[PDB]
Amino acid sequence: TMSPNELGLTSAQDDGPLGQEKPNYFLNFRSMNVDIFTVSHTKVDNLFGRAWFFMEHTFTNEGQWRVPLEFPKQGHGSLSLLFAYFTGELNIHVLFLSERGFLRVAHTYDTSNDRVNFLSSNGVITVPAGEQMTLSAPYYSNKPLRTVRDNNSLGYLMCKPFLTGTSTGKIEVYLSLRCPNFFFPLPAPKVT
Amino acid sequence: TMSPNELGLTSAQDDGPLGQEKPNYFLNFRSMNVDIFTVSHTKVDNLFGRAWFFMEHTFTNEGQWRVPLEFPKQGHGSLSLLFAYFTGELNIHVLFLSERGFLRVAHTYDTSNDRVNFLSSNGVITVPAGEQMTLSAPYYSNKPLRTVRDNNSLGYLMCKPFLTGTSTGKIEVYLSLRCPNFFFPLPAPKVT
Amino acid sequence: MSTKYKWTRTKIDIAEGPGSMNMANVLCTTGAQSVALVGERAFYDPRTAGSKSRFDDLVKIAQLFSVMADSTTPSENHGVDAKGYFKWSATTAPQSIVHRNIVYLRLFPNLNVFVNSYSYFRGSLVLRLSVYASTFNRGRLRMGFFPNATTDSTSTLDNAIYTICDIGSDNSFEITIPYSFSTWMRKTNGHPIGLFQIEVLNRLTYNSSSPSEVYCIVQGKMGQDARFFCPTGSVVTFQ
Amino acid sequence: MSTKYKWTRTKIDIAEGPGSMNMANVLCTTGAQSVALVGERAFYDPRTAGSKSRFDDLVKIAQLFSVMADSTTPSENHGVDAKGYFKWSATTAPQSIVHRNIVYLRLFPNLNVFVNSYSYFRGSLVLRLSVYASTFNRGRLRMGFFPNATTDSTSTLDNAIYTICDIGSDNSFEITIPYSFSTWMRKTNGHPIGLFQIEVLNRLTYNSSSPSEVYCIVQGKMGQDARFFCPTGSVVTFQ
Amino acid sequence: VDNFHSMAYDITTGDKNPSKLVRLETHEWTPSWARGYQITHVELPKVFWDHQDKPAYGQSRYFAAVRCGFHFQVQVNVNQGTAGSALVVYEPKPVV
RNA sequence: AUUUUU
RNA sequence: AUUUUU
RNA sequence: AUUUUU
RNA sequence: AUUUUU
Questions:
Q1: Ordered DSSP codes for chain D
Q2: Mutation choice for A interface testing from D114, D230, D237 by most A CBs within 10 A
Q3: How far is CA E24 from CA A157, E40, E66, E72, in A?
Q4: CA C41, CA C36: separation in Å to the nearest integer?
Q5: β-strand C85-89 against C227-228: which pairing, if any?
Q6: Who's near C217: CB < 8 A, 6+ residues apart?
């Protein structure tokens, strides 16, 4: 039968270990699980499998664009802030808004700003002018886990546009992740 | 058991033949092979299977672009300088930055500059303006092996753009190789 | 032999959208190209995180208690505010209110995150009142809840979902609120969850060496049947 | 029969990127089109190279000894420099230093190449000291190594990974340094490998017809468990 | 091995000694401290080598790398007449 | 309506 | 007319 | 030349 | 790592 513990009478100091799926009941009530969709939208793989805006860059020259990729404190991706460590594939969505040209895109977890000066083997995919691509950067990190908060939690993204004439433009970037491994959930964030 | 030879005590004059995978140990130690990725990044096929910038050409007329392809002393491709001879498929990545036109591309190991004046059967693939293609040139060399260092170690590349109006532009070229056969490793290169 | 027809490559019609980038369906993103040297995968290391496995479902986080409208100081208005941190005092009449307010999911740290992520949800909500008194203090307190109620006013809880709390060794009583809405799925940020009221049933008793008033904490989490559905834009920015 | 529907070509949706050229994944480049007359392959000839097979793995090259910071002249600072070419002298006290310096992968010709190619790596490193003395010279020399050490200063090697070298017929002693970093993979060009010190244990003895000081050479290579991982940009230009 | 055990202890005593339980901190709960106020902290893991009088201080000095697990026991005693509650929580570097 | 092709 | 490829 | 992948 | 989908 039902114990008084499952009827509401408990002790907060006896909750450890963390993660106790204890059932709560009372007459005329029982946990009822009803599904509306064929699958879950709470699963990490599904939720995060959907991109979210990151930032935009307006180029004028053929200079390079180096930016510390990090988890959002803004979109639905904020749900990541509930975790401390991450590891797995990273999907980067880049939109190359230009009349005539090409956009070199690369990604690395390497902090050194000189290993990027060349782009030899940092994944120089080419998005023709007015096009957009979605490259999935592997976990080529030198650290087993990525603190989820760091201003560079995610590796740096590089964008060296190869323009042809006076043409200029802007590169909007949004991103998601493929199968994410989050660990050791931390306390909920505050609001600004 | 372990011999004193495998404990550090050896003789440098007894290393030949070249290539001795001798194990080195001491108490509380043993060669531990731990893998982080599902495959090797040291294998010649994999490493070199990734392109690297070569050079860029700015065209104004419909002239032809002849250039001696060679191994890089600059990118990750430099690892080739550790070898003396090469042979195998050659992947050439060409980006045709032009408003309106077509780019004829061809490749040959033939040194004669007249067998190229026409482009009859030298592989005249067509990249429409603002496009980019990756052609894999076969080992159509008259020499069984290509000294890896030669200013023309790799065969010459031809680019005769077919423009329509006053339009002009630039052709950026980068390259990699498909399955490379390297032989007789030579001493490491110096720095500039 | 099929030599009555000149061999040719397959011809196919290309559907609407030339380079349309779908950033909504996961089945689309996971299939994106790989910039990996050989398009492979890496071996993850949970141990360094002290875990034996990654975290797959987020709902479990929504099922973790968090203080409601937590503050540094207890309710200075006899608990008539949203502060889930107030005081149970001996003075308070046997029917006076120690705390009353309208409950919203955003009033909870953990939940407020999902509120800013998902658009809808469903399931029961659990609130746990923890009164921290001494071993000498004794008394009862009835906390009820009127689902989807909006009028923030003290009212008899005889017809509301209530729980009577008798002080003892386990001074952390709970209360469950079954999903209740006109729909199969309700807004994560819209109509209140209901009216939450904790009235005094029996004055907190004490003695010469025990406190005449104690502190209380109200936590909130989702039930085992909790679910969230559509992810929507954000209504606030975290830090 | 399926004559209830007008036969048509297959319709398909084209993913993001119209002519996106992936120059990162090998699985992508190897599938590129062929300008070959019949898209075929050639028969390679290893014999002309004197080999029976091509070279498939590069790690094996990283496992080939190379002199550390090689120079034309021996260390003119009693070996306190990076020169892997110094002198072992009878004068040097029984505890004085014959060579000390911080070791980096770039200090080795062969390795420095991988340093300019790959971004990270792991595995043990092997250093082989070759002292070239006559058959009459005798003495001992202890060379230790403090992993990831950065302070270039002489220090007792009693707690460091050391190897005592007693001069005999095989005058080329080695020393292995197991992978040691806070990560499962470390920068090929970043934090030092450690402090390398070769102190005198017993003064190099000699006689009327033997040298009072000899030459030494320090080589370095990767262990059998050596690995390199991410290829990165270049930090230097070769010739 | 001394067959007479003139030292009655486990042979591996000295080895395990550094893992021994020790007093890491002891601060006084100053009354009139609002909720959320931090009573006391503790530098993990360097606190186990807090002073040269720590069992683990010895070895800790000859090694630069460490990988270990912890077992804390925060003790707070208060007479029955009094009441209150404290939050003992572990905060990884990310949280800190 | 092998009224896509065998 | 293995006169796409085996 | 499982010198595309197993 | 059915850590694309069953």
A1: ---SS-----EEPPPS-SS-B--S-HHHHTTSEE-STTS------SGGGT-SS---BSHHHHTS-EETT--SS--TTTT-SS-SEEEEETTS-SSSEEEEEEE-GGGSHHHHHHHTTBSEEES-EEEEEEEE--SS-EEEEEEEEEET---------TTSEEEEEE-SS--EEEEEE----SSSSEESSSS--EEEEEEEEEEEE--TTS-SEEEEEEEEEE-TT-EE--B---SS-B-
A2: D230
A3: 44, 11, 18, 9
A4: 8
A5: unpaired
A6: C67, C84, C85, C129, C130, C132, E85
Q: Which residue of D has its CA nearest to E59?
A: D159
Q: Which domain holds residue A38?
A: 1-192
* Chain C environment of A51 (Cβ under 8 Å): 23-24, 29
Buried/exposed code over E25-62 (b: 16+ C-beta within 10 A; e: otherwise): eeeeeeeeeeeeeeeeeeebeeebbbeeebbbeeebee
Question: Is nucleic acid strand H under 7 Å from D44's C-beta?
Answer: yes
Give D239's contacts (C-beta < 8 A, 6+ positions apart): B73, B189, B190, B191, B192
Structural domain count of chain C = 1
Mutate: best of B42, B82, B179, partner D, most D CBs <10 A: B42
Q: In which domain, by residue range, is C157 found?
A: 1-239
D-to-E residue pairs, Cβ atoms closer than 8 angstroms: 5
Burial class (CB in 10 A: 0-12, 13-18, 19+), B153: middle
CATH of the domain at D181: 2.60.120.20
The H or E element spanning position B44 is: helix B44-47
Per the structure, the count of domains in chain A is 1
User: How far from D96 is each of D132, D141, D143, D198, CA to CA, in Å?
Assistant: 20, 11, 12, 9
List the structure tokens of B118. 């026409």
Helix residue spans in chain C (DSSP H): 26-29, 59-62, 109-115
Q: Could you tell me the resolution of this structure in angstroms?
A: 3.1
User: Which of helix, strand or coil describes residue B82?
Assistant: helix
Distance from the C27 Cα atom to the nearest Cα atom in chain E, whole angstroms: 32
d(CA B78, CA B71): 7
Query: How far does Cα C5 stand from its chain's mean position?
Result: 67
Experimentally determined by: X-ray
Strand runs (DSSP E) across chain E, as ranges?
none
